[PDB]
Structure 1
Amino acid sequence: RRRRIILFPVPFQGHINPILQLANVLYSKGFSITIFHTNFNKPKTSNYPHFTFRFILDNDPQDERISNLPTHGPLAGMRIPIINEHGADELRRELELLMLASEEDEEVSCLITDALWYFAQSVADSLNLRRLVLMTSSLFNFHAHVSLPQFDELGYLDPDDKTRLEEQASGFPMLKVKDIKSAYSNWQILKEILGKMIKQTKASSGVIWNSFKELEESELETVIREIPAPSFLIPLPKHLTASSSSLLDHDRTVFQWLDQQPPSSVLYVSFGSTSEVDEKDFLEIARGLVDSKQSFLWVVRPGFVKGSTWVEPLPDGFLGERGRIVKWVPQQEVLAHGAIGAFWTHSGWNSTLESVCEGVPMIFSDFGLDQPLNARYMSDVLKVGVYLENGWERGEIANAIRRVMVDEEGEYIRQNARVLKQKADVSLMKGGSSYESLESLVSYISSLLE
């Protein structure tokens, strides 16, 4: 292969997944692939015999700054600003080492990083290496991020202010103030990071968005205005599932059980790869699921319940005939199964986009960051689900599950989800927005060294 691309993901499930999907898409277009990855949260490299992995940044002896960080929960993500602040030298060494060891007939076309590795732009510039960015969150979120200075001066980022929570955001009517407070809160660390992420995204040679035009058409002018480099909208879950990059073992016994269910009769429930709840809320969710009277498959990741290894507070047999709890599944493959009628999601972008691409309507909860914005956009703009925007109460949970899955009143939501899937499929056909994005990305990358 004449042209190599180096990809560098952020080492969490929701960032590794789209990077490795992208890597596969690019591999199928004729590029050779090297993945730079931390030892921390590494995927199974034996699932990717066609990729070269190079492990960087936390090899032994480990950096004192990284070493003692926990491997789960809130503070595991501190690896991100820490690597941004201290990783440049190593990244440069690793890139050079690879460029120096390459064959005569092989060139490195570009580096593709997660947008959150904003430090990588200066490193790539210092080597005369083009950097492209993969955004793993939505165009709508980007629009909100660039609007932060307006939100700041309007008073929305003061958490002591608890007025106007249910009002539309001034100059940004698609959101309510409470959505902005949940997304950004007071967090200075987030403000700093988003600021740098945005600045170095604008300075990059191109931006790949895990999305499609017909999903976020209202947000496209903002991106074209804010980012001078080309943007490419490719909905990665339509090209392939992220099964190979799973960091946990799959419970595939779920498929035998799904095969015993009537069509569209199962609620799939999963709150993603990093979320956690109090014991009280875990129990309220379980009761809502039971009260709904619908069959459900609930992925509860070990560590999801604060206080318990897995699901010890749950009484033995509490889920009845109708419910099953597992640790981890191949989520997109589950969402593609005929038994699934709805998806109760935490509104992480990969999960939301996967559900959209499989035509599965949603119930939304959120745990902050981009999640409330994704929930709001999907529930109010696209209208492909119901947003549980006021906590966990069994009655509310039960009503929402029933509305999406069974009520005649929710038929429009189910239909909206079916049609949105079809638009995703059409976008991949010749002349479609996604097809043209991918063709242009390949031509653009191939032109970078010329």
Structure 2
Amino acid sequence: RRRIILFPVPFQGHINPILQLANVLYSKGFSITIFHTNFNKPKTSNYPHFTFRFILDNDPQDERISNLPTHGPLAGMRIPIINEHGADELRRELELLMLASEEDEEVSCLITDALWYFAQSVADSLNLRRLVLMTSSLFNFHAHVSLPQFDELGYLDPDDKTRLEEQASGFPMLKVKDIKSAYSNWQILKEILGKMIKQTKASSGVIWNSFKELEESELETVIREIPAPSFLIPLPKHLTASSSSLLDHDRTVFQWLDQQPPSSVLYVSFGSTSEVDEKDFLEIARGLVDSKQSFLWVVRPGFVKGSTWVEPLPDGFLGERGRIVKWVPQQEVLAHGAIGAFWTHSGWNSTLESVCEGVPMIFSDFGLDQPLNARYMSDVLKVGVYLENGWERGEIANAIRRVMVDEEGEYIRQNARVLKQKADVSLMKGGSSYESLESLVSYISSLT
């Protein structure tokens, strides 16, 4: 009997992939222990089959995180804080857990978010193998390792170098526009992106939340840059991240979706972290109204700057085919037959979820890996359209309509339907994802 310890980054788009992986691994016969901060903790009563151990965040709270808040662009400062100061606590806790293990039981390995690059020299010190879980796409990692050339071509200078915004250099997928968006706040990113890449290269294995036919162009880079084995597993095809939600689900939404004709409803959701200037939020609203299609729109409270949920929204300005909710079980909704399209912020989990449900997309982005996910899905796969010039109602309403109603967008809908079938075929015996999971499980069993 073998135990796996998993250590997520405590944000929605990080615990979701990592707890899906833990359920999958638990299905292959492993014991699961999850290490978590108290901050942003999942409902552990939804995981009766997991052991939960809360660390680094506890109750005589250290002063670097003691006053750090819980909302907005800022709570993420715990990732650098914990990377630079958490090693000794992580080592005691791993030592305690190994010491407390029954002897018919062995810790096969540690799996952490790639962002926890500090975990690598901790696991080494304990002669424990660490595997990395990547929460964004092989394609964006190819951009990360391409960064030395980007900076030297003048691409990440947002001020002094502008206005050469089309086809980019050793990377014809993207426009220069997309590289500047991706790395806008530059040297916060490069230290973590540096140390993260350096220590996943040093890990014992990298698990990618993806499937081979989704990013086949990018495989050779990952094989050539990372000596550690790589495994491509599409987690949304295995299970939803539903029970690792950190907000309560509406689920009244399903009685209303049951009243829509098939493929007639646009799902709108801009992630778990994004915020928008009220001026922008009412232009998004009017684009939905001008589109003339039914929409179900998740507006997470705080989304709007600065209001507490939608107080700028008028009469029911929306309504008679529009609905606003605070939070849904997103993938379950994408799977309901009423949903014909998904307007996303191009977060990698949402994007993969929609790909795995066969829903074409409209792409907006808020930076980081998002504009490259958006360009990749919209121009290489061509499973949606990309609104790359900001918020304008007209251009919003034509994007929605072209994906959902226009004959001209039928190839985009067909692409989405086919991409899904490729994800399901990869899961069957002899498929790319199936063989990765079989390799990963046998690999983890040999580390023991």
CA distance in structure 2 between the partners assigned to 1:197 and 1:276 by the alignment: 26
Equivalent residues of 2:178, 2:371 under 8 A apart? yes
User: 1:318-368 deviations in whole A, cap 9, x for unaligned?
Assistant: 012010000000000000000000000000000000000000000000000
Equivalent residues of 1:213, 1:433 under 8 A apart? yes
**By how many angstroms is 1:84 displaced?**
0.4
Equivalent residues of 1:343, 1:355 under 8 A apart? yes
User: 1:381-417 deviations in whole A, cap 9, x for unaligned?
Assistant: 0000000001100000000000000000000000000
Q: Could you say what secondary structure the match of 2:212 adopts?
A: coil
**By how many angstroms is 1:178 displaced?**
1.0
Equivalent residues of 2:155, 2:161 under 8 A apart? no
User: 1:237-268 deviations in whole A, cap 9, x for unaligned?
Assistant: 00000001000000000000000000000000
**By how many angstroms is 1:288 displaced?**
0.1
CA distance in structure 2 between the partners assigned to 1:139 and 1:399 by the alignment: 31
Equivalent residues of 2:297, 2:323 under 8 A apart? yes
The structure-2 alpha-carbon separation of the partners of 1:147 and 1:87, relative to structure 1 and needing over 3 Å to count, comes to same
Uncovered stretches (5+) of structure 1, i.e. residues with no partner: none
Q: Could you say what secondary structure the match of 1:133 adopts?
A: strand
CA distance in structure 1 between the partners assigned to 2:72 and 2:380 by the alignment: 31
CA distance in structure 2 between the partners assigned to 1:61 and 1:182 by the alignment: 40
| Equivalent pairs, count | 448
CA distance in structure 2 between the partners assigned to 1:76 and 1:289 by the alignment: 31
CA distance in structure 2 between the partners assigned to 1:285 and 1:315 by the alignment: 14
Give identity over the alignment, percent: 100
Q: Could you say what secondary structure the match of 2:33 adopts?
A: strand
CA distance in structure 1 between the partners assigned to 2:238 and 2:57 by the alignment: 32
**By how many angstroms is 1:62 displaced?**
0.8
**By how many angstroms is 1:164 displaced?**
3.9
Root-mean-square deviation (CA, aligned residues, Å) is 0.7
**By how many angstroms is 1:316 displaced?**
2.5
CA distance in structure 1 between the partners assigned to 2:66 and 2:272 by the alignment: 21
User: 1:92-149 deviations in whole A, cap 9, x for unaligned?
Assistant: 0000000000001000000000000000000000000000000000000000001111
CA distance in structure 2 between the partners assigned to 1:355 and 1:125 by the alignment: 38
CA distance in structure 2 between the partners assigned to 1:204 and 1:156 by the alignment: 30
CA distance in structure 1 between the partners assigned to 2:81 and 2:38 by the alignment: 15
Equivalent residues of 1:158, 1:186 under 8 A apart? no
CA distance in structure 2 between the partners assigned to 1:76 and 1:162 by the alignment: 31
Equivalent residues of 2:87, 2:118 under 8 A apart? yes
Q: Would you say 1:366 and 2:365 are equivalent positions? A: yes
**By how many angstroms is 1:165 displaced?**
4.2
CA distance in structure 2 between the partners assigned to 1:334 and 1:157 by the alignment: 37
**By how many angstroms is 1:185 displaced?**
1.2
Once the two structures are overlaid, the 10-residue window that deviates more, 385-394 or 182-191, is 182-191
**By how many angstroms is 1:186 displaced?**
4.1
Once the two structures are overlaid, the 10-residue window that deviates more, 184-193 or 222-231, is 184-193
User: 1:168-194 deviations in whole A, cap 9, x for unaligned?
Assistant: 111111111111111101421101110
When the two structures are superposed, what TM-score results if normalisation uses the length of structure 2?
0.99
Residue in structure 1 matched with residue 275 of structure 2 by the alignment: 276
CA distance in structure 2 between the partners assigned to 1:105 and 1:242 by the alignment: 31
User: 1:187-226 deviations in whole A, cap 9, x for unaligned?
Assistant: 2110111000000000000000000000000000000000
**By how many angstroms is 1:162 displaced?**
5.1
CA distance in structure 2 between the partners assigned to 1:359 and 1:99 by the alignment: 43
User: 1:40-78 deviations in whole A, cap 9, x for unaligned?
Assistant: 000000000000000000101111111212211111111
CA distance in structure 1 between the partners assigned to 2:162 and 2:77 by the alignment: 32
Equivalent residues of 1:248, 1:328 under 8 A apart? yes
The structure-2 alpha-carbon separation of the partners of 1:135 and 1:331, relative to structure 1 and needing over 3 Å to count, comes to same
CA distance in structure 2 between the partners assigned to 1:11 and 1:169 by the alignment: 34
Runs of 4+ in 1 over 4 A off after TM superposition: none
When the two structures are superposed, what TM-score results if normalisation uses the length of structure 1?
0.99
Q: Could you say what secondary structure the match of 1:175 adopts?
A: coil
CA distance in structure 2 between the partners assigned to 1:73 and 1:138 by the alignment: 24
CA distance in structure 2 between the partners assigned to 1:15 and 1:233 by the alignment: 17
**By how many angstroms is 1:271 displaced?**
0.3
CA distance in structure 2 between the partners assigned to 1:411 and 1:395 by the alignment: 20
